[PDB]
Amino acid sequence: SFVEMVDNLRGKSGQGYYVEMTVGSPPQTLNILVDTGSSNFAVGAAPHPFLHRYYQRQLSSTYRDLRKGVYVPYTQGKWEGELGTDLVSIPHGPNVTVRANIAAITESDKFFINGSNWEGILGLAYAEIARPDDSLEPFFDSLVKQTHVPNLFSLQLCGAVGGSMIIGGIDHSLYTGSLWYTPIRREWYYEVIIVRVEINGQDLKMDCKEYNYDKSIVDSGTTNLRLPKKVFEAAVKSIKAASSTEKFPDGFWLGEQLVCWQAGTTPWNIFPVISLYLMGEVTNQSFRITILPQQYLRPVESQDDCYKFAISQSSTGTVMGAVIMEGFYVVFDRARKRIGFAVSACHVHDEFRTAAVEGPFVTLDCGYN
């Protein structure tokens, strides 16, 4: 109903945002990771060193085994298991219950995270990247087909963890400024197009096709801003440059090690802002999201302040992870093939620089084919 949905996501810093859900009759309560970079609904369905609870199909008078197996590889970990359907509802979501495909995770490899407090994954992307193939209708597609929930969801992910997932519409009480929309290039991943990248106003000077080699995606279930080999080296080089007045292990830039400062004395100001120019809704029109250092230096667990560098290389294209999403209010407007960004209530405060969604701007394409 909306207020009912605000603050429906928890997580522990750096381990992923989950929403509560229920599967089966009687209802079984599970914490489910919100993942826009995939398309399978899947829950642990067997004991595991990291699972404090799981799905027990036999205890469901509504479970229908589909007799198929399923394997899902992510960048990070992987799992396989048993396909089936069941009844699913979201306590602090809309007031509906839907029959949806469920993958019962029977074994997994580096998937579950110790102390993460979630036990499954909600893949909110399109059917074209469902496993085993696009015949396996994704939870959200079931939701819209089986009910009146509009084809739309929004994600307010908070840092410094909580946030909100508004299913079915836009809660205006949760963002300021205006919504800026970028076209979903193609309905598989949420694919978007980056037309320009700026660091403290310096242009990276690359052919805009490089920012999107071989795709750019918006993915609530990846931690980092991930950048293509070329773009990444160029960005690091500029962030290193602008902060060389300090010392870092040269593995810190690969994320393997931390940097520390004493409480309240982090030199935030020597870390540059990053600006991503996303393609607009009209010809030759952009807009930008600006990303503060408080966003790409993730705070990591003595009473010193320590940070991981949360920008990493990728060779499967750009991924606008939690790093990028945490500032902003993000609208996945499926009905209109577009992704909106506005600044969030829980945005990063700093008495000098602000994260912002701003525009319009102009340019003269940038997609990889």
Ligand SMILES: CC(C)[C@H](NC(=O)C[C@H](O)[C@H](COc1cc(F)cc(F)c1)NC(=O)c1cc(C(=O)N[C@H](C)c2ccccc2)cc(N(C)S(C)(=O)=O)c1)C(=O)Nc1cc(C(=O)O)cc(C(=O)O)c1
């Ligand atoms: C099946 C596809 C839809 C699949 N989609 C995805 O992998 C993207 C998802 O968002 C996928 C889902 O989430 C997972 C969370 C886990 F804990 C484990 C895990 F395995 C996954 N995420 C990731 O792969 C991922 C998660 C994380 C990560 O840390 N996630 C945690 C839970 C999190 C923490 C804070 C905020 C939000 C989430 C990190 C990364 N990085 C590589 S990183 C270090 O940030 O740069 C990646 C995919 O693209 N698979 C695939 C991968 C590759 C490849 O990279 O090698 C190649 C292909 C292919 O066939 O083309 C297909």
